[PDB]
Amino acid sequence: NATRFASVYAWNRKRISNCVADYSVLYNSASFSTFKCYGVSPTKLNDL
Amino acid sequence: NKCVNFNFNGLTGTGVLTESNKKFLPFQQFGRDIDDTTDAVRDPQTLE
Amino acid sequence: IANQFNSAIGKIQDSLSSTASALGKLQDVVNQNAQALNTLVKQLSSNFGAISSVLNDILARLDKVEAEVQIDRLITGRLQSLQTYVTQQLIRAAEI
């Protein structure tokens, strides 16, 4: 929901740490056009 | 001292979990056998 | 005669107390089996081109289709490990 996304020639990286997480709230978001996960099945994000 | 399916901070297995007299160094969380497999673990809630 | 016979028995007891490379033919069979076991163990740590080298680590991260494409591989690489392990042992069992 954040206002400005970084120009990719200088793309931006958020570091996330020291927290619990949930990904059910991502996959069950209506907005997404694409959600490909390559190391881990998208549902399994919630048991790791 | 009973046989259980387990998930220790995402590192799963099946086995008997039992106490240890092997003193881990303060920074360590997994141990490993000769067979490379996880022979010992430190619990994330209670540091035994 | 009996003394020179006992003298040779004495030399054997001292010899076996003094050496181990003489038993080297029994050492050889157990060492062939020791490194053969050690080889099969190392192969459980091989990735075999899969995403990951450990089965239960995969079961912690994939589901049903993108999981089985990895499980058939681990199976292939390990199956070859067993074929070769048992081939190396069978031709060994003929030596023994």
Short mmCIF file of all heavy atoms in Angstrom, two decimals, chain A residues 37-45 47-48, chain C residues 51 57-64 66-67:
data_model
loop_
_atom_site.label_atom_id
_atom_site.label_comp_id
_atom_site.label_asym_id
_atom_site.label_seq_id
_atom_site.Cartn_x
_atom_site.Cartn_y
_atom_site.Cartn_z
N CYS A 37 5.82 -18.89 -6.75
CA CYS A 37 6.85 -19.28 -5.77
C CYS A 37 7.70 -20.45 -6.21
O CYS A 37 7.19 -21.50 -6.58
CB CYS A 37 6.23 -19.57 -4.40
SG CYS A 37 5.69 -18.14 -3.49
N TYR A 38 9.00 -20.25 -6.15
CA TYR A 38 9.91 -21.14 -6.84
C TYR A 38 10.63 -22.11 -5.91
O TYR A 38 10.92 -23.23 -6.29
CB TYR A 38 10.89 -20.26 -7.62
CG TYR A 38 10.19 -19.26 -8.51
CD1 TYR A 38 10.16 -17.92 -8.12
CD2 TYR A 38 9.59 -19.67 -9.72
CE1 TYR A 38 9.61 -16.94 -8.96
CE2 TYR A 38 9.01 -18.71 -10.57
CZ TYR A 38 9.02 -17.34 -10.19
OH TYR A 38 8.55 -16.41 -11.05
N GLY A 39 10.90 -21.71 -4.67
CA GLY A 39 11.54 -22.59 -3.68
C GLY A 39 10.58 -23.29 -2.71
O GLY A 39 11.03 -24.06 -1.87
N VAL A 40 9.27 -23.00 -2.77
CA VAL A 40 8.30 -23.31 -1.69
C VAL A 40 6.88 -23.12 -2.20
O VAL A 40 6.59 -22.07 -2.77
CB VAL A 40 8.58 -22.42 -0.47
CG1 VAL A 40 8.69 -20.93 -0.81
CG2 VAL A 40 7.60 -22.64 0.68
N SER A 41 5.99 -24.09 -2.02
CA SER A 41 4.63 -23.96 -2.55
C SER A 41 3.89 -22.83 -1.82
O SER A 41 4.01 -22.77 -0.60
CB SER A 41 3.79 -25.25 -2.42
OG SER A 41 4.38 -26.30 -3.14
N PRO A 42 3.14 -21.91 -2.47
CA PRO A 42 2.69 -20.67 -1.80
C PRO A 42 1.94 -20.84 -0.48
O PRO A 42 2.07 -20.03 0.43
CB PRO A 42 1.84 -19.93 -2.84
CG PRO A 42 2.39 -20.43 -4.17
CD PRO A 42 2.85 -21.85 -3.90
N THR A 43 1.21 -21.93 -0.32
CA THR A 43 0.50 -22.26 0.93
C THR A 43 1.46 -22.59 2.09
O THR A 43 1.22 -22.23 3.25
CB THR A 43 -0.41 -23.48 0.70
OG1 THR A 43 0.34 -24.55 0.19
CG2 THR A 43 -1.51 -23.14 -0.31
N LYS A 44 2.62 -23.17 1.78
CA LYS A 44 3.60 -23.66 2.74
C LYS A 44 4.39 -22.52 3.39
O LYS A 44 4.98 -22.68 4.46
CB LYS A 44 4.59 -24.65 2.09
CG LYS A 44 3.88 -25.87 1.45
CD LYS A 44 3.11 -26.78 2.41
CE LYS A 44 4.00 -27.53 3.40
NZ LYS A 44 4.55 -28.79 2.83
N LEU A 45 4.34 -21.33 2.83
CA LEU A 45 4.78 -20.11 3.49
C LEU A 45 4.20 -19.99 4.90
O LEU A 45 4.81 -19.37 5.76
CB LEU A 45 4.38 -18.90 2.63
CG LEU A 45 5.24 -18.54 1.40
CD1 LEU A 45 6.55 -17.89 1.80
CD2 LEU A 45 5.54 -19.71 0.48
N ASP A 47 3.70 -22.50 7.10
CA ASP A 47 4.11 -23.58 8.06
C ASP A 47 5.64 -23.76 8.17
O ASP A 47 6.14 -24.83 8.53
CB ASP A 47 3.29 -24.85 7.88
CG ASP A 47 3.20 -25.46 6.48
OD1 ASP A 47 4.12 -25.35 5.67
OD2 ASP A 47 2.20 -26.14 6.19
N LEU A 48 6.36 -22.64 7.92
CA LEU A 48 7.82 -22.50 7.80
C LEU A 48 8.36 -21.34 8.67
O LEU A 48 7.62 -20.48 9.17
CB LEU A 48 8.22 -22.27 6.33
CG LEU A 48 8.36 -23.53 5.50
CD1 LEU A 48 8.57 -23.19 4.03
CD2 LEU A 48 9.60 -24.36 5.92
N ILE C 51 15.82 -29.60 -6.12
CA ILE C 51 15.86 -28.38 -5.31
C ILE C 51 16.67 -28.49 -4.03
O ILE C 51 17.28 -27.51 -3.63
CB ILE C 51 14.45 -27.91 -4.94
CG1 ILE C 51 13.64 -29.03 -4.22
CG2 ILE C 51 13.75 -27.38 -6.18
CD1 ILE C 51 12.29 -28.53 -3.69
N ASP C 57 13.07 -32.05 4.49
CA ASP C 57 13.19 -30.62 4.19
C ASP C 57 12.30 -30.19 3.03
O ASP C 57 11.69 -29.13 3.09
CB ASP C 57 14.67 -30.32 3.92
CG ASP C 57 14.93 -28.86 3.51
OD1 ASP C 57 15.14 -28.02 4.42
OD2 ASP C 57 14.97 -28.55 2.29
N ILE C 58 12.15 -30.98 1.96
CA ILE C 58 11.23 -30.75 0.85
C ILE C 58 9.79 -30.85 1.32
O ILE C 58 8.96 -29.99 1.02
CB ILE C 58 11.48 -31.73 -0.32
CG1 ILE C 58 12.91 -31.53 -0.89
CG2 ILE C 58 10.41 -31.47 -1.42
CD1 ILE C 58 13.30 -32.66 -1.86
N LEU C 59 9.46 -31.88 2.10
CA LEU C 59 8.11 -32.02 2.67
C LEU C 59 7.75 -30.85 3.60
O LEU C 59 6.60 -30.44 3.70
CB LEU C 59 7.98 -33.38 3.35
CG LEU C 59 8.16 -34.58 2.42
CD1 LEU C 59 8.10 -35.89 3.21
CD2 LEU C 59 7.09 -34.61 1.33
N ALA C 60 8.74 -30.17 4.19
CA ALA C 60 8.50 -28.92 4.90
C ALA C 60 8.22 -27.72 3.98
O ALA C 60 7.75 -26.70 4.47
CB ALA C 60 9.68 -28.64 5.83
N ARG C 61 8.48 -27.78 2.67
CA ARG C 61 8.36 -26.61 1.75
C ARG C 61 7.53 -26.76 0.46
O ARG C 61 7.02 -25.74 0.02
CB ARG C 61 9.77 -26.00 1.50
CG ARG C 61 10.78 -26.95 0.82
CD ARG C 61 12.24 -26.77 1.24
NE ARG C 61 12.89 -25.67 0.54
CZ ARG C 61 14.13 -25.27 0.74
NH1 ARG C 61 14.90 -25.81 1.64
NH2 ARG C 61 14.64 -24.37 -0.02
N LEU C 62 7.33 -27.94 -0.14
CA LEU C 62 6.47 -28.07 -1.35
C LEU C 62 5.16 -28.82 -1.04
O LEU C 62 4.93 -29.23 0.10
CB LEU C 62 7.25 -28.73 -2.51
CG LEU C 62 8.26 -27.85 -3.29
CD1 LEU C 62 7.62 -26.65 -3.96
CD2 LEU C 62 9.41 -27.31 -2.47
N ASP C 63 4.28 -29.03 -2.01
CA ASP C 63 3.10 -29.89 -1.87
C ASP C 63 3.10 -31.20 -2.72
O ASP C 63 3.48 -32.25 -2.21
CB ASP C 63 1.80 -29.07 -1.95
CG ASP C 63 1.56 -28.33 -3.27
OD1 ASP C 63 2.34 -28.55 -4.23
OD2 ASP C 63 0.60 -27.54 -3.34
N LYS C 64 2.62 -31.21 -3.99
CA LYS C 64 2.09 -32.41 -4.67
C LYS C 64 2.64 -32.66 -6.06
O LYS C 64 2.82 -33.82 -6.43
CB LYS C 64 0.56 -32.39 -4.73
CG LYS C 64 -0.19 -32.41 -3.38
CD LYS C 64 0.27 -33.51 -2.39
CE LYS C 64 0.46 -34.92 -3.02
NZ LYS C 64 1.13 -35.85 -2.06
N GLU C 66 5.14 -29.93 -7.92
CA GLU C 66 6.48 -29.38 -7.72
C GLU C 66 7.24 -30.03 -6.55
O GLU C 66 8.45 -29.81 -6.47
CB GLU C 66 6.41 -27.85 -7.58
CG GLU C 66 5.24 -27.33 -6.75
CD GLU C 66 5.33 -25.83 -6.47
OE1 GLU C 66 6.11 -25.12 -7.13
OE2 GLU C 66 4.66 -25.38 -5.52
N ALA C 67 6.57 -30.82 -5.68
CA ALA C 67 7.25 -31.73 -4.76
C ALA C 67 7.68 -33.02 -5.47
O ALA C 67 8.86 -33.32 -5.51
CB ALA C 67 6.37 -32.06 -3.56
#
